[PDB]
Amino acid sequence: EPTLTPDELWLVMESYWKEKGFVRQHLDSYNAFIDHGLQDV
Incomplete structure (x- = not known):
């Protein structure tokens, strides 16, 4: 087939x-900082 x-x-x-x-x-990596970044520090 071609x-x-x-x-x-x-x-x-x-x-x-x-x-x-x-x-x-x-943009995408900062988006994850709001969800799981602040709560772990």
Whole structure:
């Protein structure tokens, strides 16, 4: 079978950034600090 193309693999990676954003590391980790961070200190 004509395996995919190098152009359908674009549509997989296009769904990666419209689902989760680009500022992930700051935003997501701080989100966990509110839940389980303050209570343990």
